[PDB]
């Protein structure tokens, strides 16, 4: 918990939201995505401590941010999470010479920012992002297929808000190591209490655009993906071995876009718990050419 | 399914066991574990083509093999799977100048039928092996630590006779490539039906041995580790890397036997996926040193 310790809080839209935040200078920002939280990042960011303000923020009702009041299935969708993200960073400053860092629906997350504030943006580092909306299934990793179209059924709230299955069957899948018990317990703490607390794990898989649903995560992220394709800003992608979201043809796509730097770390979707240092050192000497 | 068309059968106490045969002379037996079948070898018995008589048995209730009458929790036990499979192999009359080549459940099989046949054996080889008992959870690894004390609970009926859950969750997480969807159904196959032919996939975690339960196991696991520490039976160990079950402390112990070489592949636990060839090549050059 002395990471957790080190966590500020503030007030948005009337909700406390936790991030870390250390250091001066232009803005340095972690998303994390589901089912995680900053402390995805922790073993990253003392690798850009001093080269910036580093912010990672606890997206809305996950880490130690405050969960939703009256929870339920229109709860915690990407819009929503927007809302409370985006207004955090507005309150941080974060507004100019902005460099991101960004995995799986922080990715999506962080994308959708850069692109709606293009001028803004020094730099976008990435690792096993949201860089394509689906057309069909038959592009969905076999690793977690079934999990997710039953995820996109009724039988999602129990998987989720009953069993916990994205924390207790999705994360440790794709992780190569063990994660010792007290990291697996961090990943479960926002998430213990059966029921709505666990609903920002449910409503991700099911914003995932598959098929043109949901319609606008869909337009929204097929807007972003035509833009990285021509943007000049600097781009950093930490391409995994094997990897799961971004491998075969996807990877091909991604290398095509402009001002692109590449580095390759092991690991499958949860990469950051394989390669943090890797993945750090990359990162710091990507900025350090900004 | 040219594999499958490939399988022939044998009425073993009145149910029919499923197995590959190919070629002549002295046997080379493959056994697989939960929650696999002799599909799992289809990669690497090429590598032994012309070597000897290749026999791969799906265990009962697995692959091909018959499902039990009455199934029901006191199925499919690790001494079930003993009264079936080593009956089956003294009516193929395996019986002399054997080698093994074993994993997970398949290898507390075989390294039990090395033990009472200790005069038959040739050489083992194994990968991703019941190598020990453990004294405490807290040596299990976490990848699937809490799935396994949940599928040991009373919540393990419904985790896997309705969910599928073993099948679904545990074999995609724990293999380093993504599966094609037809070589994920091959595995789906046999436990395509809710209710008790997913038995063998819940009673099999429920059998491994931990903090002395159950005391059938755990008494005939120490007893053959034990004498894997002693025995001058040739012993190839495959490492795989990462691994799951044999990492860390565990190698070191596996490390100490008698006449044993050892190569590393990459891999998880199914490491048959990500590693058919290497393994093959091994087990060949070992085989021709016997
Ligand atoms: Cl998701
Ligand atoms: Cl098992």
Same mark, same amino acid.
């Given at each position: ?11 948005v839209?009337?909700?406390?939201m ?13 998303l ?25 923020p606890?997206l809305i ?20 999470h927007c809302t409370y993200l985006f207004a955090l960073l ?19 997350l962080?994308?959708?920012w ?116 021509? +943007?000049?800003?600097?781009?950093? #992608? &930490?391409?995994? *071995?094997?990897?799961?979201? !971004?491998?075969?043809? /996807? @990877? %091909? ?10 580095? +390759?770390?092991?690991?499958?979707? #949860? &990469?950051?718990? *394989?390669?943090?240092?890797? !993945?750090?050192?990359? /990162? @710091? %000497? ?5």
């Amino acid at each position: 918990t002395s990471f957790r310790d080190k966590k500020k809080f503030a007030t948005v839209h009337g909700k406390q939201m936790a991030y870390i935040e250390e250091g001066t200078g232009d803005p340095i920002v972690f998303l994390h995505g589901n089912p995680m939280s900053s402390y995805l990042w922790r073993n990253i960011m003392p690798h850009l401590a001093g080269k910036g303000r580093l912010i990672a923020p606890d997206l809305i009702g996950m880490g130690d941010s405050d969960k939703l009041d009256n929870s339920g299935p229109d709860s915690y969708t990407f819009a929503e999470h927007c809302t409370y993200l985006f207004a955090l960073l507005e309150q941080l400053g974060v507004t100019e010479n902005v460099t991101l860092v960004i995995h799986d629906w922080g990715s999506g997350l962080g994308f959708h920012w850069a692109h709606t504030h293009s001028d803004a943006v020094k730099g976008i580092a990435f690792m096993e992002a949201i860089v394509e909306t689906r057309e069909s299934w038959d592009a969905f990793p076999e690793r977690a297929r079934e999990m997710f179209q039953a995820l996109r059924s009724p039988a999602g709230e129990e998987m989720v808000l009953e069993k916990n299955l994205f924390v207790e069957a999705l994360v440790p899948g794709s992780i190569l190591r063990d994660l010792t018990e007290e990291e697996m317990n961090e990943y479960r703490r926002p998430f213990a209490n059966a029921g709505e607390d666990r609903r920002p794990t449910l409503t991700f898989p099911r914003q995932v655009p598959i098929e043109g649903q949901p319609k606008d995560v869909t337009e929204l992220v097929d807007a972003y993906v035509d833009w990285l394709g021509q +943007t000049s800003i600097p781009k950093l #992608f &930490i391409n995994a *071995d094997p990897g799961v979201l !971004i491998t075969g043809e /996807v @990877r %091909d796509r991604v290398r095509s876009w402009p001002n692109l730097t590449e580095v +390759t770390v092991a690991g499958l979707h #949860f &990469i950051q718990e *394989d390669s943090p240092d890797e !993945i750090g050192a990359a /990162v @710091r %000497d990507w900025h350090a050419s900004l």
